[PDB]
Design a protein around this nucleic acid. Structure first.
Ligand SMILES: [K+]
Ligand SMILES: [K+]
Ligand SMILES: [K+]
Ligand SMILES: [K+]
Ligand SMILES: [K+]
Ligand SMILES: [K+]
Ligand SMILES: [K+]
Ligand SMILES: [K+]
Ligand SMILES: [K+]
Ligand SMILES: [K+]
Ligand SMILES: [K+]
Ligand SMILES: [K+]
Ligand SMILES: [K+]
Ligand SMILES: [Mg+2]
Ligand SMILES: [Mg+2]
Length: 1326
RNA sequence: GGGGGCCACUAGGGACAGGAUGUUUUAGAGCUAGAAAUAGCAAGUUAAAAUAAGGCUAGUCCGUUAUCAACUUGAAAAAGUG
DNA sequence: CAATACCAAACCTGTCCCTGTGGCCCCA
DNA sequence: TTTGGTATTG
């Protein structure tokens, strides 16, 4: 008994089928367990496992980190309170107690209900004096009087609990404090550089213009209009644009070659690049520019002069409050006079988006502005209010979403000011000033992680001493060096060849020397007199490195031909091979360090090698400039302070893939030279890295094998590189294979054919914004778009093309997108790529050139520079540009077309290879006489296009919406096609079986599947035999008279084992919304003592799994015991408690005399069978999902495919004629559905509405009726009910809101395939 | 030629350090007429605390990813059963 | 009960690591 | 988005 297995791996399904020699699917009698009269059941060996999508760990990580942030903010507040404790107890012994219980109702409060002062008079007086906390903050910053210690604490705690961001390094307010001075300084340095061309900035109000709340380009345009004869793209205009945050191009200002694109948000290296060109005199000007940028950015936040207060942030918040009060008074009076009938709706109705809903309801600032703008325009005297509205500065709150701009240095400034003011009166404030400042300023460094003590699987921090870590002892306790080192080392891999040696930093001088020599050793050259191309000698390589690679960042073939061959070897003409255009490798770190230290002989001396290797290591291993300085301190005696200061600023990222002990460590026994020594000089062999480590005449290979040195199935799958969903699918696939082998008497299959399925608007908006602002285009200003709109392909392409045709240098129209074309760069007949990377928006595809290849040479000549512009704006990826410009490189060769066609059939994804390797190592385990693996089971891998084209060519159509059978059918067809293909052409095994002339292969791989067809009309016409056999063995592979009927019969089988994977629900406890208080037991307490009737809380908890409880409950005021059998849902939160002791939990819920052995655990999707084969699945403890599949006959499936328009003229006509001849199928299909629905679905209202809808549109075209019949199957689909639409009628989901019936139905436990069952008659309980 | 190093580019994962909102209860004395409903007016911008219940291992740590049909034997971890 | 309509926590900064696809150079 | 919880309405 022989057989093969077909598998179909997806993100939510694994289809499986077993085939025999005749491509038939067996059927067995499987034993049935339980308490029913059923002792066995007949099963076809075909089916599909279904499961919910596997989830990433991202949301869990975000929740975890936010948890930690909340804990540590609470800890900051606790630190501050511990500092204040004794003196606050002297002032008010219950202040912090009233603060802690501020949330409680007065009934539960143990102290007075007024927090700050404990009596109503002082509280109302405070609130009248300081209506916002920022009033108190400004008062405590400015005033000189001794203040109440409680108000001091309130200010400092408001600053610490909400402390602003840490994106800016260093300190703030360094001079500056105004824009006018820095604009004046920029004008002064400009006039210093251009005495002949000065700028008259007199009468120019830079403060208002550059601090005005307008777009950067608009403030640019304003300031430039203020200066006549100076344009926006001149030098001064570009400096002001750089200050405003734009990306100006300084190339045209200095007649440059290198594109001097500068954005102050790579800028250090970009500016050093540009500064290399015009070195002296031009650095201080850009210094002034960046300073002006900082001033404008701060003016965005501080909207009050900084000379009347040391609390400009609090003063700006008070400005917000005062303008809010004034504008609210004016708006109230205006509405009272002009539209008095609307006043109530605006100022009393929380449901509307007026001021009532704005302050008390749920309306946002945006919703309120939208609600009130029409009212403002309809009235008189609202022009200034509309100005403040369109600038988003009307009736502003102080606690808003845009406060994220506030850096922590400003809050720290106000905190330090208050501490300086009040430490004169409180000695403990003087002694703890820096402590409180540190509380505000201290972050745990990202390279340190959780400050754990051996109970966190996420932590890596090592501590210098065993004691509690505080913000003040962090450096003394935490080993920041070892922690920052472990941060990188636990994530970087080791040398694969030497698994114990760490890999080198990517920018290591040794590593780049290695790469350069390894590329250079394979270069070959020819001249006239030479008989044969020769390698470069060690001397020639050293000369090229010392002359070209050590004097230019990049070395072109031009530089190699001219600066070496002509100058040294005196070769007027030389032909170079092994390199094209320029060398890929380069000694970048060499030149970085040459610019920083300016001592070339130091860099060339090998004595300093180690030192240099360490420095780079430091610069790569750490990012904190202070730790970099501490590590480089041991070299402070070797470099001038300028060089050291320039060095500690230079940092590197990334790691190599080989170790230092591999490059320049291990040596060959006889030659005594390392790998790098071989790369530099190796006589006339010039062996490269692969050859060097694979040469048996050398000791490197055996040392690698000697140095080279257990995981479970789940561990191995979890460590794969892929999405977690497909990994869940892979694990389920392996489990299915194991169970299927057990079904076949432990016999291993002949073959296993596997196929793996092919696997945001904010990112599109970000791409388009960055590309357009890098492009300097006004199309975004003239055409506003929302992120959702970018889900349209043509509009996204329009904005990615700056509103132009791509094949012609002409304007495009948004309104005319329905008339334009979306073309494939490389034609889809070669590369089945439908992504934005291979698609393009043009006016007409005809303008691409010929449709049989890449865009023509003419279109390339015309459009290449526009394409490069779109590429630099990152509106085009490099691959898209290269496929567009392929024509200038020869276009598509015949080899390229052959490779594209082979790609469509031969799977080369790595994840599929890993699935194949797992299954292959699981099936084949024995070794032969030569100790080579015995391949009993051939693991074949196919691409979906094979079986797709098979279905379409032999009318084995699939319709996904009818049911889930198509997964199992795909697995079956995979098994059949794969086995038949490798039987017909065994030589293709190396292509399709895991383990170990362009026109010819094009034709071959195009016609690989023709052996299934009887006649093949490939342009002329040819025909094939009825029986297809192997050429050598003479064995039969395909009988076109009998085997196609076998496939039809297999696909028509109604009994297919569809199994929905039962899963305990995990995740959050309940819905996240904190609901207001309500008289309902559905509310869940947010804290142990917070009675939800008083404090509100959560509802809508998730049921981890239900439990069948058979027990008794008290009834009536008599508490009389009454036997019950019902479904109790255990919420996720309750699950641990319920599992620690189920009897105590159930008795706590009210059940008595619980029959402990009759407790049945029922996870989600638990299957129940009732009457007439009707099946339900457990959606919850109180709701059910549809549990039955509609096995629609194959004739109706193919009719629905063809009629709905889901080729040759004669064949299209034959299919249309078949559709019209079998129009009655329509009614028949309806009938089928109806019967199914009346037997299983039981939705009388929905079914009647659907029948009326079908009888309403009987005059509609057949195609439309068919594609609506496709929608109809949502009523009958397995799983959760859902709403659908028949033409323009909407059918709402009929839900199953009661689970009482399944308590007497038959519970079905299914193995992973569903072949093994256990059926429990629940009627026999209770 | 499965594989490997490099260069240019873009998809799929993982971890950590932080920010600004949101929500919830309470505090911010509403007034006047009315028995009451209710009417007329005034006011509104702020703060505290919580932000998965909580856990022990008590850390300025952990608490939403992964994994799970049933049954026998097992404390589990496991194997085994048609 | 049965049916119906409504509801659902979101945004952002920075540091770093990895594998993967895919055009090119060189090899095993 | 999809889909299970919730309060209303009979
Ligand atoms: K993040
Ligand atoms: K009380
Ligand atoms: K001008
Ligand atoms: K609101
Ligand atoms: K190159
Ligand atoms: K670094
Ligand atoms: K889930
Ligand atoms: K789960
Ligand atoms: K919320
Ligand atoms: K490669
Ligand atoms: K993308
Ligand atoms: K109130
Ligand atoms: K199962
Ligand atoms: Mg907590
Ligand atoms: Mg808040």
């Amino acid at each position: 008994k022989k057989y093969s297995i077909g598998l179909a791996i997806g993100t939510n399904s694994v289809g499986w089928a077993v085939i025999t020699d005749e491509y038939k699917v067996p059927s067995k009698k499987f034993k049935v367990l339980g308490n029913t009269d059923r002792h066995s059941i007949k099963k076809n060996l075909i089916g599909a496992l279904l499961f919910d999508s596997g989830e990433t760990a991202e949301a869990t990580r975000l929740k975890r980190t936010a948890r930690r942030r909340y804990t540590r903010r609470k800890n900051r507040i606790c630190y501050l309170q511990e500092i204040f404790s004794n003196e606050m107890a002297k002032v008010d012994d219950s202040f912090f107690h009233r603060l802690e219980e501020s949330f409680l109702v007065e009934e539960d409060k143990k102290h007075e209900r007024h927090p700050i002062f404990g009596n109503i008079v002082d509280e109302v007086a405070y609130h009248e004096k300081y209506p916002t906390i920022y009033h108190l903050r400004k008062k405590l910053v400015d005033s000189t009087d001794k203040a109440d210690l409680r108000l001091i604490y309130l200010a400092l705690a408001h600053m610490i609990k909400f402390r602003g961001h840490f994106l800016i390094e260093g300190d703030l307010n360094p001079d500056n404090s105004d824009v006018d001075k820095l604009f004046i300084q920029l004008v002064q340095t400009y006039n210093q550089l251009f005495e002949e061309n000065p700028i008259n900035a007199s009468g120019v109000d830079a403060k208002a213009i550059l601090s005005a709340r307008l777009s950067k380009s608009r403030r640019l345009e304003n300031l430039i209009a203020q200066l006549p004869g100076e344009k926006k793209n001149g030098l001064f205009g570009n400096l002001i644009a750089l200050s405003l945050g734009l990306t100006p191009n300084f190339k045209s200002n200095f007649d440059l070659a290198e594109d001097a694109k500068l954005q102050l948000s790579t800028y250090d290296d970009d500016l050093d690049n540009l500064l290399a060109q015009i070195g002296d005199q031009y650095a201080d000007l850009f210094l002034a520019a960046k300073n002006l940028s900082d001033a404008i950015l701060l003016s965005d936040i501080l909207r009050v002069n900084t000379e009347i207060t040391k609390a400009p942030l609090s003063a700006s918040m008070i400005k917000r409050y005062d303008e809010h009060h004034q504008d609210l008074t004016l708006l109230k009076a205006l509405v009272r006079q002009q539209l008095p009938e609307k006043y109530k709706e605006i100022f009393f109705d929380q449901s509307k988006n007026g001021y009532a809903g704005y302050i008390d309801g749920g309306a946002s600032q945006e919703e309120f502005y939208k609600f009130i703008k029409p009212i403002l325009e309809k009235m008189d005297g609202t022009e200034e209010l509309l100005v403040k509205l369109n600038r988003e500065d009307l009736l502003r709150k102080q606690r808003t979403f845009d406060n994220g701009s506030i850096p922590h240095q400003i809050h720290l400034g106000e905190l330090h000011a208050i501490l300086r003011r009040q430490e004169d009166f409180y000695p403990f404030l003087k002694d703890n000033r820096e402590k409180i400042e540190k509380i505000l300023t201290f972050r745990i460094p990202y390279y340190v992680g959780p400050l754990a003590r051996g109970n966190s699987r996420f932590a890596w921090m090592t501590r210098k001493s065993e004691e509690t870590i505080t913000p003040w002892n962090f450096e003394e306790v935490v080993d920041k060096g070892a922690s920052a080192q472990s941060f990188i080392e636990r994530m970087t891999n080791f040398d694969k060849n030497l698994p114990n040696e760490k890999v080198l930093p990517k920018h290591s001088l040794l590593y780049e020397y290695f790469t350069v020599y390894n590329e250079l050793t394979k270069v070959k050259y020819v001249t006239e007199g030479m008989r044969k191309p020769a390698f470069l000698s060690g001397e020639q390589k050293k000369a090229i490195v010392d002359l070209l690679f050590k004097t230019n960042r990049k070395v072109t073939v031009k530089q190699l031909k001219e600066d070496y061959f002509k100058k040294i070897e005196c070769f007027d003409s030389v032909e170079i091979s092994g390199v094209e255009d320029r060398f890929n490798a380069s000694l970048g770190t060499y030149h970085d360090l040459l610019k920083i230290i300016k001592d070339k002989d130091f860099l060339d001396n090998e004595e300093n090698e180690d030192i240099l290797e360490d420095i780079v290591l430091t610069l790569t291993l750490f990012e904190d400039r202070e730790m970099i300085e501490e590590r480089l301190k041991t070299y402070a005696h070797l470099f001038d302070d300028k060089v050291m200061k320039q060095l500690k600023r230079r940092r590197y990222t990334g790691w190599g893939r080989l170790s230092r002990k591999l490059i320049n460590g291990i040596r060959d026994k006889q030659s005594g030279k390392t790998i790098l020594d071989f790369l530099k000089s190796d006589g006339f062999a010039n062996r490269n890295f692969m050859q060097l480590i694979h040469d048996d005449s050398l000791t490197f290979k055996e040392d690698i094998q000697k140095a080279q040195v257990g995981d479970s199935l789940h561990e191995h799958i979890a460590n794969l590189a892929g999405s977690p969903a497909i990994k869940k699918g892979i694990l389920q696939t392996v489990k299915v294979v194991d169970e299927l082998v057990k079904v076949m008497g432990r016999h291993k299959p002949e073959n296993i054919v596997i196929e793996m399925a092919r696997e945001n608007s904010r990112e599109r908006m970000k791409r388009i914004e960055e590309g357009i602002k890098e492009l300097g285009s006004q199309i975004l200003k003239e055409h506003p778009v929302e992120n959702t709109q970018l889900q349209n392909e043509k509009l996204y392409l329009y904005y990615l093309q700056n509103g132009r045709d791509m094949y012609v240098d002409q304007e495009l129209d948004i309104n005319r997108l329905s008339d334009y074309d979306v073309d494939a760069i490389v034609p889809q007949s070669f590369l089945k790529d439908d992504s934005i990377d291979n698609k393009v928006l043009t006016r007409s595809d005809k303008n691409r050139g010929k449709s049989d290849n890449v865009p023509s040479e003419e279109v390339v000549k015309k459009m290449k520079n526009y394409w490069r512009q779109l590429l630099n704006a990152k509106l085009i990826t490099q691959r898209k540009f290269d496929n567009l410009t392929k024509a200038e490189r020869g276009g598509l060769s015949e080899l390229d077309k052959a490779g594209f066609i082979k790609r469509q059939l031969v799977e080369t994804r790595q994840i599929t290879k890993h699935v194949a390797q797992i299954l292959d190592s699981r099936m084949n385990t024995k070794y032969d006489e030569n100790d080579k693996l015995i391949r009993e089971v051939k693991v074949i891998t196919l691409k979906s296009k094979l079986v797709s084209d098979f279905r379409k060519d032999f009318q084995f159509y699939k319709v996904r919406e009818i049911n889930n059978y198509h997964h199992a059918h795909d697995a079956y067809l995979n098994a059949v096609v794969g086995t038949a293909l490798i039987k017909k052409y065994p030589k293709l095994e190396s292509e399709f079986v895991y383990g170990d002339k362009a026109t010819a292969k094009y034709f071959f791989y195009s016609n690989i599947m023709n052996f299934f067809k009887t006649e093949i009309t490939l342009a002329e016409i040819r025909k094939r035999p009825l029986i297809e056999t192997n050429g050598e063995t003479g064995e039969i592979v395909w009988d076109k008279g009998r085997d196609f009927a076998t496939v039809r019969k297999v696909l028509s089988m109604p009994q297919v084992n569809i199994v929905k994977k039962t899963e305990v629900q995990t995740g959050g406890f309940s819905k996240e919304s904190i609901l207001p208080k309500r008289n309902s037991d559905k509310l869940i307490a947010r804290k142990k003592d917070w009675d939800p009737k008083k404090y509100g809380g959560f509802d809508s908890p998730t049921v981890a799994y239900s439990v069948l409880v058979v027990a008794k409950v008290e009834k009536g005021k008599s508490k009389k015991l009454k036997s019950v059998k019902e479904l109790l849902g255990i919420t996720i939160m309750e699950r641990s408690s319920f599992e620690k002791n189920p009897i105590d939990f159930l008795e706590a819920k009210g059940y008595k005399e619980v029959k402990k052995d009759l407790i049945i655990k029922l996870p989600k999707y638990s299957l129940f069978e009732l009457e007439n084969g009707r099946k339900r699945m457990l959606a919850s403890a109180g709701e059910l999902q549809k549990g039955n599949e509609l096995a629609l006959p194959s004739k109706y499936v193919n009719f629905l495919y063809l009629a709905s328009h889901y080729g040759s003229p004669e064949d299209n006509e034959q299919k249309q004629l078949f559709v019209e001849q079998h129009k009655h199928y329509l009614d028949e299909i309806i009938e089928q559905i109806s019967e199914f629905s009346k037997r299983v679905i039981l939705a009388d209202a929905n079914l009647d509405k659907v029948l009326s809808a079908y009888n309403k549109h009987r005059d509609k075209p057949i195609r439309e009726q068919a594609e609506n019949i496709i929608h109809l199957f949502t009523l009958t689909n397995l799983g959760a009910p859902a709403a659908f639409k028949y033409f323009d009628t909407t059918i709402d989901r009929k839900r199953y809101t009661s689970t009482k019936e399944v308590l007497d139905a038959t519970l079905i436990h299914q193995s992973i395939t569903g072949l093994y069952e256990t059926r429990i008659d629940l009627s026999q309980l209770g």
